[PDB]
Amino acid sequence: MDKFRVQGPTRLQGEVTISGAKNAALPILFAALLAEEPVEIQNVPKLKDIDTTMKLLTQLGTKVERXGSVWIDASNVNNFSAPYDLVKTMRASIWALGPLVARFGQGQVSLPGGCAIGAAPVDLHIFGLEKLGAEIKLEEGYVKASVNGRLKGAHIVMDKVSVGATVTIMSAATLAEGTTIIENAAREPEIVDTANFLVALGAKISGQGTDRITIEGVERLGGGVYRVLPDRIETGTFLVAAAISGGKIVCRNAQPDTLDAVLAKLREAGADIETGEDWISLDMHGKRPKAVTVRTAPHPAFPTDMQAQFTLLNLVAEGTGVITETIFENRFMHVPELIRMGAHAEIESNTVICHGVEKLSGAQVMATDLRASASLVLAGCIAEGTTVVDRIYHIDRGYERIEDKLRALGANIERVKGE
Ligand SMILES: CC(=O)N[C@H]1[C@@H](OP(=O)(O)OP(=O)(O)OC[C@H]2O[C@@H](n3ccc(=O)[nH]c3=O)[C@H](O)[C@@H]2O)O[C@H](CO)[C@@H](O)[C@@H]1O
C-alpha cells in the first residue's frame, strides 16, 4: 500500500496547472455512452477513476483510447451490464445506468458502496429514471433499468439536490420522447459541463447551472469534441495549499467563476486573491490564515469537496473556526487524523469546531477518502517533521499528479511502498 512521506514545514509557493475536472470528465465519459458517433473528450485528467471508467466503458462495448483527450467510440455498445468487479471502486459507476437504458432500452449496474464519506444511495437516480418511464429493479446488488421503446419526458421535481442524480436524469432525458424538466437540479459547474457536452452531441438542454434544467429529447446523439472544464476542487486544494503555508500560488488553466464561494472564503481567511480569465492567484504574504466559518451546500455555495481542505485551514488558522458539513454524513474522517497532528477540534454532529494551532506535528495519518487524503498531504507539508499519509491510492483516484504538483510548489514529498 503506497504512502506519502512528507517532510515539513514547507511553504507552498509557485504555480500549478489545473487538470480537467474529475467531476466533469466522469459524467461526460458516461454520457458518451449516448454517442452514436466518434467523441473526443479533451482535457481529461489522468486519474484512476478515469481508468476505471474507461475500463467499464470498454466492457460495455465502447471503443476507448486516451493519451490529453479520451477518444470514445460508443457506436457498438452491446453489453448493458456493469459488473461488481468493474464498479466496486467507484460510486460514479451509477452513471452508466441512465445512458444505457436511454439508448439501449436496458441497463444494469452493480451498486458500488462508495467511499466512507457517506452512503451511496441512488434513490434519486432511480427516481428520475422511473419518472422517465424506466422500470427499475433492485436485485442481486444490482440496479436494473428497462423501458419499452423510448424514455419519456417528465417533470421531475428533485426533493433533494443531487449532483449525481441530476447527471443521470439530464443524460437519460436527452434521448427521451418529449421534454424533461429537472426541478431543483444540481447547479454544479460539472452539470453545466456535462450539459454542454450533451448539447455538443446534438442534445437539447437549457437551464444548466440553474435549479431548473430543461431537456428536449432527441432520437439520437451523434459525436463531437468537448473540453472538460478545469477541476475546481483541485484548484481549491492548491489555493488552500498556499493559504495554509504562508505561500503564494498561481493556478493556471483555472476557471475562476466556479469558485466564488471558495474564493470568498479564502478572502475571509485573509488571502490576497487575484483572478484572470483562466487563472487564480493566492498570496498569503507569509501570513497565517484567519479562521473561518464554513457551511457546505450545493453549488454555488461552499463545496463539500473543499470541506476537508478548509478544516485543515481552520486547524492551522488564527482563531476559532466552524465547519458545517451538510452534504455527507461521514465526512469528518480527517479530523481525528489532524488532531493526531496537534490540531484542536471538537465535533458536534455535522459541525466541527476548530481551534487553530500555530503548528502541526508530523504524524502517521490515514487517508480515508479523496479530499481528506489530499488534506493530510497538505497538513504534512506544513507540519513540523515527518508525516506519513497511508493509503494514498485514495488520492490517485481523483488527483492528477498531485505529488509532482506539490513538489513543484516546494513540498518535500515522497511516494513509498510497504502497506
Ligand atoms: C463523481 C462526482 O462528481 N462526485 C461528486 C458528486 O457526488 P454525488 O453525485 O454522489 O453527490 P450527490 O450530490 O448526489 O450527493 C449529495 C447528498 O445526496 C445524497 N443522495 C445522492 C443521490 C441519491 O440518489 N440519493 C441521495 O440520498 C448523498 O448520498 C449525499 O448525502 O457530488 C458531491 C457533492 O458536491 C461531490 O462531493 C462528489 O465528489
Roughly what angle, to the nearest 10 degrees, separates helices 123-131 and 163-173?
Answer: 20
Catalytic residue status for 115? yes
Burial of 349 (0-12, 13-18, 19+ CB in 10 A): exposed
| CA gap 49, 6 in Å, rounded | 24
How far is the centre of ligand 1, averaged over its atoms, from the C-alpha of 333 (Å)?
Answer: 17
Q: What are phi and psi of 387, to 5 degrees?
A: -115, 130
Give the distance from CA 239 to its chain's centroid.
16
How far is the centre of ligand 1, averaged over its atoms, from the C-alpha of 377 (Å)?
Answer: 24
Going by DSSP bridges, is the β-strand pair 248-252/279-283 parallel, antiparallel, or unpaired?
A: antiparallel
374, 361, 233, 203: which is closest to 296 by C-alpha?
233
* Sign of the alpha-carbon dihedral angle for 386, 390, 395, 400: positive
Residue 163 and residue 115 in contact, taking contact as beta carbons nearer than 8 Å: no
Ligand 1 site residues, Cβ closer than 6 angstroms: 23, 26, 91-92, 118-125, 160, 162-165, 186, 190, 303-305, 327-328
How far is the centre of ligand 1, averaged over its atoms, from the C-alpha of 163 (Å)?
Answer: 5
How far is the centre of ligand 1, averaged over its atoms, from the C-alpha of 122 (Å)?
Answer: 9
Residue 140 CB-half CA count within 13 A: 11
Residue 228 and residue 28 in contact, taking contact as beta carbons nearer than 8 Å: yes
Residue 181 and residue 156 in contact, taking contact as beta carbons nearer than 8 Å: yes
Q: Which of 115, 251, 354, 381 is catalytic?
A: 115
Domains of the chain with CATH codes: 1-18+230-418 (3.65.10.10), 21-228 (3.65.10.10)
Residue 1 and residue 389 in contact, taking contact as beta carbons nearer than 8 Å: no
The residues pairing with 385 across neighbouring beta strands, listed in sequence order, are 8
Going by DSSP bridges, is the β-strand pair 106-110/81-82 parallel, antiparallel, or unpaired?
A: parallel
- The ligand 1 atom nearest the CA atom of 190: 3
Q: Which residue has the cell 444548466?
A: 208
- The ligand 1 atom nearest the CA atom of 124: 24
First to last CA, the chain: 4
| CA gap 39, 31 in Å, rounded | 10
* Other Cβ atoms closer than 10 A to 344: 14
> Which of 95, 117, 310, 327 gets mutated to test ligand 1 (max ligand atoms within 8 A of its CB)?
327
Residue-wise DSSP of 40-72: EEES----HHHHHHHHHHHHHT-EEEE---EEE
Residue 47 and residue 22 in contact, taking contact as beta carbons nearer than 8 Å: yes
Q: For residue 401, what are the contacts with CB-CB under 8 A and spacing of at least 6?
A: 19, 46
* Elucidated via: X-ray
| CA gap 336, 346 in Å, rounded | 10
The three state secondary structure string of 286-335 is: CCCCECCEEECCCCCCCCHHHHHHHHHHHHCCECEEEEECCCCCCCCCHH
Residue 379 CB-half CA count within 13 A: 39
